[PDB]
Ligand binder design. Structure first.
Ligand SMILES: CC(=O)c1ccc(-c2cc(NS(=O)(=O)c3ccc(C)cc3C)c(C(=O)O)s2)s1
Ligand SMILES: CC(=O)c1ccc(-c2cc(NS(=O)(=O)c3ccc(C)cc3C)c(C(=O)O)s2)s1
Length: 558
């Protein structure tokens, strides 16, 4: 079974595409080596098509079935509700792709009769037809990176009407089931601090810890019909209304298992027989399937007390070491088993004995010290991509503000604090847009956030320690300094000066702005302040922020 089959029609763009970093009067203050940054375009779609097109083979043994039976037993305890049309509509992002049937995200969010009527019609069709493949659009994603160039990734999604129907039938399922089936192993239930806490405690739970990350080669393409039907059988274990059962069966047969691909010009590009990257179940399905295969593989490889952390296709395993030589052999067997389950590795997995050396979800655990000198572990990552994207956002407004999402997720880091916060608050101040809400993404879901609320948000997600970390590790320091040299990003003395300036402007503004100045830039002054809990913090409603992953799920909140 080929992951895809093609007709020859090109994967066309839906709008003008820029590959080179746009430059304005602000660019240089952040990055000088402009030619290092680029954005992927449909022009490289061909290359990607060749990488994601291959045959899949699967040999399922008793370990696989034993793990599956256990997962289904847990899924049976779940009771999920069918969402109402209005509820599903409110979860639609304001700028989500418009329907091909005469209405857009705006009409959906406002519950217009035209949109609500078509949605209802699509729903009825799902109930009465469980065989006809549903159309999907295939587009080349425009993503920014630093060279040393990768081809654009591909996104496959059904019409807006179908997406609302997916929410109605499955939102409650994909939001509640993974945590029940996988418990503490389900990664999306954790905020960055909780993820670090889980990784550290798990590591400490082993007499002689050993860990490794497992990178599957183009995971979506390795997902087979069997995998997708297996996922449906797990969903069906839930206590569901009969109408929901029918809808899930229908969406599985007509959309999740596969279907035709249509480019932006309306031409048939081919056919998909693997995971669709732009459906509501993409994250939950990848997570369940990755966890199923990995769990079974741990048994085949005989790993001791293998604890796992799964986020979609991202997998991290921490177990009890049985000796260096043996761990290496076990990992080999693990990879062989994963391969038999149609989850071949991209990069061969290697055993690590230093927690901080394991990268998962493009991040790693590191350590610093708080105002009290106490050791504190936090999540960080290589800042190259975040900075390249920040450069792009410096001269171009985008649907998703990566800089804001990165400040929220990596607030305790040296780079997010010194550069991202300083640079963007400087711009927000000059343009008087501090109070303007911006969209960013957390675990795949889109959120509208006011920059002025960052202090509270950071306090709630990372704790006051995020505003006073210091004495970072040499490893982290060198990686940050190397990245800055590579990109041609100005040094500390420059950022410290800009930070003091920004901090002074914010303080004068008063209100929330002053709070931003005091907490976000305390590191920039020589005579540090108090920094005590923020009252308004408790006000913020962060429920649903770290519950589940919705990558490509077309999900919006507030
Ligand atoms: C290349 C480069 O600019 C740098 C390399 C290492 C640097 C570092 C500056 C520090 N100290 S600091 O100047 O007080 C500082 C600056 C900025 C923030 C957000 C926090 C703190 C505590 C470091 C540390 O304490 O570990 S590492 S700065
Ligand atoms: C307290 C603390 O750890 C720090 C305070 C300021 C730091 C800084 C370290 C730097 N550079 S470095 O690449 O890390 C570096 C290069 C060469 C040597 C010989 C040493 C270093 C550290 C800074 C800068 O470039 O502005 S500030 S690091």
């Amino acid at each position: 079974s080929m992951s895809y089959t093609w007709t020859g029609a090109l994967i066309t763009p839906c709008a003008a595409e820029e590959s080179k970093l746009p430059i304005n009067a602000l660019s240089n203050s952040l990055l000088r080596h402009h030619n290092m940054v680029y954005a992927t375009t449909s022009r490289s779609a061909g290359l990607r098509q060749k990488k994601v097109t291959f045959d899949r083979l699967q040999v399922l043994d008793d370990h696989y079935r034993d793990v599956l039976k256990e997962m289904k037993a847990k899924a049976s305890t779940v009771k999920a509700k069918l969402l109402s049309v209005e509820e599903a509509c409110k979860l639609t992002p304001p700028h989500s792709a418009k329907s091909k049937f005469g209405y857009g995200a705006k009409d959906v969010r406002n519950l217009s009769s035209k949109a609500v009527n078509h949605i209802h019609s699509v729903w009825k069709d799902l109930l009465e037809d469980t065989v006809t493949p549903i159309d999907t659009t295939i587009m080349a994603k425009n993503e920014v990176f630093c060279v040393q160039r990768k081809p654009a990734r591909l996104i496959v999604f059904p019409d807006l009407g179908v997406r609302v129907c997916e929410k109605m039938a499955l939102y409650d399922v994909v939001s509640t089931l993974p945590q029940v089936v996988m418990g503490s192993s389900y990664g999306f239930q954790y905020s960055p601090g909780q993820r670090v806490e889980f990784l550290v405690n798990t590591w400490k739970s082993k007499k002689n810890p050993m860990g490794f990350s497992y990178d599957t080669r183009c995971f979506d393409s390795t997902v087979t019909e069997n995998d997708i039907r297996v996922e449906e059988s797990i969903y069906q274990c839930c206590d569901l209304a009969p109408e929901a059962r029918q809808a899930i069966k229908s969406l599985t047969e007509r959309l999740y298992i596969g279907g035709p691909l249509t480019n932006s010009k309306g031409q048939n590009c081919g056919y998909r027989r693997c995971r669709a990257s732009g459906v509501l179940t993409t994250s939950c399905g990848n997570t369940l399937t990755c966890y199923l295969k990995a769990s079974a593989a741990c048994r085949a490889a005989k790993l001791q007390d293998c604890t796992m952390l799964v986020n979609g296709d991202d997998l991290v395993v921490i177990c009890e070491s049985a000796g260096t030589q043996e761990d290496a052999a076990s990992l080999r067997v693990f990879t062989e088993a994963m391969t038999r389950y149609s989850a071949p590795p991209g990069d061969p997995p290697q055993p690590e004995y230093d927690l901080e050396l394991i990268t998962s979800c493009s991040s790693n655990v590191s350590v610093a010290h708080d105002a009290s000198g106490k050791r504190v572990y936090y999540l960080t990552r290589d800042p190259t991509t975040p900075l390249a994207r920040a450069a792009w956002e410096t001269a171009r407004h985008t649907p998703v503000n990566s800089w804001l999402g990165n400040i929220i997720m990596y607030a305790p880091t040296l780079w997010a604090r010194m550069i991202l916060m300083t640079h963007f608050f400087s711009i927000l101040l000059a343009q008087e847009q501090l109070e303007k809400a911006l969209d960013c993404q957390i675990y795949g879901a889109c959120y509208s956030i006011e920059p002025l609320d960052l202090p509270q948000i950071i306090e709630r997600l990372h704790g006051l320690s995020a505003f006073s970390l210091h004495s970072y590790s040499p490893g982290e320091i060198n990686r940050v300094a190397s990245c800055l040299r590579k990109l041609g990003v100005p040094p500390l003395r420059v950022w410290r000066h800009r930070a003091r300036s920004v901090r002074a402007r914010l303080l004068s503004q008063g209100g929330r702005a002053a709070t931003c100045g005091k907490y976000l830039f305390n590191w920039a002054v020589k005579t540090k302040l108090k920094l005590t809990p923020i009252p308004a913090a408790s006000q913020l409603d962060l429920s649903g922020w770290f519950v589940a992953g919705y990558s490509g799920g077309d999900i919006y909140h507030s």
